[PDB]
Structures are given as structure tokens and as C-alpha cells.
Amino acid sequence: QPEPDMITIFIGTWNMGNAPPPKKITSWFLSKGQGKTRDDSADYIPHDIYVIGTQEDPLSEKEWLEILKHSLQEITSVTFKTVAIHTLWNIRIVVLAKPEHENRISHICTDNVKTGIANTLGNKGAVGVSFMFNGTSLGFVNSHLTSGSEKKLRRNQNYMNILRFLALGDKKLSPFNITHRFTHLFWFGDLNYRVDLPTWEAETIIQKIKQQQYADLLSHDQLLTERREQKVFLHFEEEEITFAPTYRFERLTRDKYAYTKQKATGMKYNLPSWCDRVLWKSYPLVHVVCQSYGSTSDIMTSDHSPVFATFEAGVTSQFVSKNGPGTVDSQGQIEFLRCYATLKTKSQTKFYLEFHSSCLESFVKSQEGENEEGSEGELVVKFGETLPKLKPIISDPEYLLDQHILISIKSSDSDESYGEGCIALRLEATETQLPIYTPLTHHGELTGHFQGEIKLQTSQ
Numbered sequence: 001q002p003e004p005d006m007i008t009i010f011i012g013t014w015n016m017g018n019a020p021p022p023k024k025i026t027s028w029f030l031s032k033g034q035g036k037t038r039d040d041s042a043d044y045i046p047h048d049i050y051v052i053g054t055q056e057d058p059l060s061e062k063e064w065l066e067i068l069k070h071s072l073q074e075i076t077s078v079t080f081k082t083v084a085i086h087t088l089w090n091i092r093i094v095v096l097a098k099p100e101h102e103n104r105i106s107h108i109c110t111d112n113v114k115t116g117i118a119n120t121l122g123n124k125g126a127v128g129v130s131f132m133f134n135g136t137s138l139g140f141v142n143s144h145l146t147s148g149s150e151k152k153l154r155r156n157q158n159y160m161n162i163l164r165f166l167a168l169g170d171k172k173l174s175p176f177n178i179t180h181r182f183t184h185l186f187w188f189g190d191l192n193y194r195v196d197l198p199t200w201e202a203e204t205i206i207q208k209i210k211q212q213q214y215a216d217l218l219s220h221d222q223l224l225t226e227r228r229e230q231k232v233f234l235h236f237e238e239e240e241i242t243f244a245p246t247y248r249f250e251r252l253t254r255d256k257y258a259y260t261k262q263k264a265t266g267m268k269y270n271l272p273s274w275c276d277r278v279l280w281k282s283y284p285l286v287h288v289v290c291q292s293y294g295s296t297s298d299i300m301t302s303d304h305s306p307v308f309a310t311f312e313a314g315v316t317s318q319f320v321s322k323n324g325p326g327t328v329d330s331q332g333q334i335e336f337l338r339c340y341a342t343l344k345t346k347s348q349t350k351f352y353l354e355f356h357s358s359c360l361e362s363f364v365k366s367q368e369g370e371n372e373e374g375s376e377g378e379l380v381v382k383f384g385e386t387l388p389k390l391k392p393i394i395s396d397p398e399y400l401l402d403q404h405i406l407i408s409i410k411s412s413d414s415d416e417s418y419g420e421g422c423i424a425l426r427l428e429a430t431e432t433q434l435p436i437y438t439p440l441t442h443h444g445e446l447t448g449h450f451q452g453e454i455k456l457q458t459s460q
């Protein structure tokens with residue numbers, strides 16, 4: 001039985017509004033309703049992995065697992081296996097996989113982060129799951145961020161706290177946050193960003209939604225505008241939104257948006273908004289294609305509608321050669337030529353690099369670079385031709401060209417990372433000097449760039 005080179009992944013996010021679900025929720029897992037929907041001809045085809053994020057979830061883990069599994073079994077006639085379940089307060093993530101994947105999945109991790117302090121600590125935060133699927137690392141984050149139209153900055157701060165402090169994936173990748181630890185990272189939830197238009201415009205917004213004219217609403221969506229100004233979710237992608245705002249509905253219908261201020265809302269307006277979102281970040285030149293992104297129309301127990309997204313995701317095999325794992329393969333090498341980092345820092349320590357990759361027996365530390373001043377004020381750290389030759393465990397190009405090198409630039413004085421990035425080995429040529437580039441981030445914010453050339457030797 002061959003190992004797959006692609007899998008499909010279902011992502012669901014639903015703020016359940018503290019109410020039990022209705023008896024049938026299959027439309028969610030079938031990607032039916034509004035937006036980019038899944039073809040009817042696929043309805044019986046199971047996804048490989050289902051990842052369900054809930055917020056304001058009133059159910060026990062047992063109660064929700066029984067609903068989810070019985071739902072999938074009705075759709076597919078497959079009994080899914082539970083990979084992981086993790087709950088923080090009323091924020092929950094469930095990962096289910098087809099039984100054939102049980103032996104392909106390993107290194108299962110769970111974590112949570114509580115956001116805010118005192119007043120603002122007690123119900124918002126995130127849960128996450130990571131695991132390996134054969135040679136591919138997968139991360140999943142369900143976050144419930146701060147509510148309210150005038151708190152976009154708090155939401156951005158919640159995002160940074162979550163990506164700093166959520167402890168998933170390989171702990172040996174110590175300089176790297178979750179935004180670098182995974183081949184594919186999916187981040188979803190009730191992110192709570194709003195359509196920023198005046199309150200007086202509520203009925204106009206409702207009109208536009210009834211006409212399915214979302215353009216003048218999406219141009220005021222705080223998540224898209226904050227992302228465009230590089231305030232949040234730097235280097236993540238989102239599919240185009242082609243479904244109506246998923247919040248705030250009157251329960252038991254979808255015919256009415258309940259936006260007016262009430263004692264129960266803290267006297268806040270809830271203009272119709274895309275609170276419920278799915279974003280992703282995959283390593284460079286790895287296959288990832290969004291095949292659905294939408295909302296259900298027939299699940300009405302909550303003041304939010306469920307959101308679905310599905311993905312094709314490239315995966316790689318566990319690789320064994322006569323040499324690695326357990327030794328190097330002398331027919332392989334990775335050379336960095338003429339490399340330099342450009343950093344935004346005002347500091348003047350020396351810097352060194354660390355190269356981390358599962359194609360190496362362990363991470364590699366460079367010598368210190370040579371600091372120069374850039375023409376527009378910047379620090380440039382030159383490595384020239386000084387960088388250590390990297391010795392991969394396997395030389396076979398079918399393995400090596402699918403790998404990635406994580407880079408951290410660290411202060412000699414503090415050993416703290418000033419910037420992290422990622423280089424794909426999916427090159428146009430081997431034994432050929434080719435340009436490389438990554439932006440560098442720290443705590444998910446842009447701190448610099450790394451560029452140079454690479455020369456990759458494989459056994460072919």
C-alpha cells in the first residue's frame with residue numbers, strides 16, 4: 001500500500017454560543033452552504049484529517065466526540081480515530097483521522113495559552129494540536145480572541161501572545177515559535193475581528209448582505225486591514241471570503257442579524273462581521289490548496305454560523321536509506337555562499353546563525369558574521385563564504401529537494417534569536433549557485449531579511 005504524497009484536511013470553526021448543537025450538523029463537514037463549497041460528487045469521500053475548533057462550547061469532551069464521530073460515520077461509513085482533544089475553558093480542538101492513518105501519525109502534542117491579565121484573563125485564549133504525518137509536521141491552532149469592535153489592537157496582542165507561548169511541535173527547535181515549526185500550520189477560530197463601519201450604517205450593511213455584495217464590507221474587515229498593514233498574521237494566507245458575515249444572528253433562523261446594543265452585550269453594537277476565520281502558513285514551495293471556504297446555512301443554534309475550510313496538503317514519506325537516519329550520506333551537501341542578514345535592530349552585538357532541519361543529525365552553529373552599516377541606517381551581518389557546509393542524513397534528491405532549512409540569527413552576547421526564517425531546498429537545479437531569500441521575524445513581527453546563494457549536492 002503506497003504512502004500518500006497528498007492528503008485532504010478539513011478545518012471547522014464554530015462559536016456555539018453556549019447552546020447544544022442541533023441533531024444534524026453534517027452540512028458543516030460536507031462544506032455545504034455559502035461561499036466556496038464542495039462538489040456534491042465528493043460527499044461520500046472522507047477527508048484524511050478533520051480538525052474541529054469550537055468556542056463557547058457547552059458540551060463535555062465525551063458529548064462532543066460522540067456527535068462528531070457519529071456525524072462523520074453517517075457521511076462516510078468510516079469510524080474515525082481520535083488523534084487528540086484539548087479544551088481550555090469553553091475553547092476546544094478535536095483532531096480525527098481515518099483509521100488507516102493511525103500508524104502514520106506520531107509525536108502528538110497539545111497545549112493552550114490563556115490571554116490577558118486579571119480582568120481580561122478568564123475566558124479568551126487558544127488551544128492547539130501538532131503531530132507528524134509521516135515526514136510532514138502539521139500544527140493546528142483554535143483561538144477565541146478578545147471581542148468588541150474597538151479592540152482590534154487587543155486581538156493583535158492576543159495573536160502575538162498565542163504564537164509566542166503555545167508550545168507545540170519539536171522542542172529542539174528552540175529559537176522557533178509555532179509560525180516556523182510546521183510544514184503546514186492552520187490557525188482558525190472566533191478571531192473576533194469586525195467590519196469597521198459606523199453604527200448608523202447597520203441597516204445599509206444588512207442590505208448589502210442580502211444582495212450578496214460583500215466588497216464594500218470586506219474593505220472594512222479589521223482582519224484584512226490589519227493584515228494589509230502587517231499588524232497581525234504576517235506571512236499567513238486566507239482564501240477569499242464569498243460567504244455572508246457569520247455573526248451576529250438571531251438564534252433559530254439565519255434571516256436576521258441581531259446587531260443592536262443590549263444589556264446582554266454590555267451595551268455594545270455587533271454589526272455583522274466575519275468573526276470566524278481560517279488562515280494558514282505553509283513552508284515555501286510546499287503544495288497547499290484551499291478547496292472550500294464557506295459557512296453553513298442550516299445550523300442555527302448559535303448566534304454564529306459554523307465555518308468550514310478544506311485543503312489539499314503535500315506530505316512526504318518517512319525516508320530510510322542504507323546511510324541515514326543514524327549517519328550522514330557523504331554524497332549530499334548544502335553550501336551557503338555570499339550570505340548576509342539585514343536586521344532592523346539598533347543593537348551592536350556580534351551575530352551567529354543556527355541552521356535547523358530534520359535533514360541534519362542536529363542543528364549547526366555558524367561562526368560570527370561581520371557587521372557593516374547599511375546605506376539607509378540598517379545593520380548588515382555578512383557571512384560571505386564562511387558558513388559551515390551542512391551534511392544531510394540522506395543524499396537522495398527525492399528526499400533532499402523536499403526539505404527545508406530553518407535559520408535563526410542569534411546574538412553572541414545573549415544567545416537570543418533576533419530573527420527566524422525558512423529556506424526551501426526545492427531548487428531549480430543542483431550543483432548550481434542559486435539565489436535564496438527569507439524574511440526574518442521574531443515573535444511573528446518582521447525583524448530583517450536573509451539572502452544569499454545556495455549550492456545543493458544530491459546523489460544525482
Ligand SMILES: CC(=O)N1CCN(CCCc2ccccc2)CC1
Nearest residue numbers: 081082083084085101102105108110
Ligand atoms: C492528547 C489526546 O487527546 N490523546 C488521546 C488520543 N491519543 C491518540 C490515540 C492513538 C492514535 C490515534 C490516531 C492516530 C495516531 C494515534 C493520543 C492522546
Ligand SMILES: CC(=O)N1CCN(CCCc2ccccc2)CC1
Nearest residue numbers: 223224225226227228229230236237
Ligand atoms: C508571492 C505570493 O504569492 N504571495 C506573497 C504576498 N502575498 C500578498 C498578500 C497581500 C495581502 C492582502 C490582504 C491582506 C494581507 C496581505 C500573497 C502571496
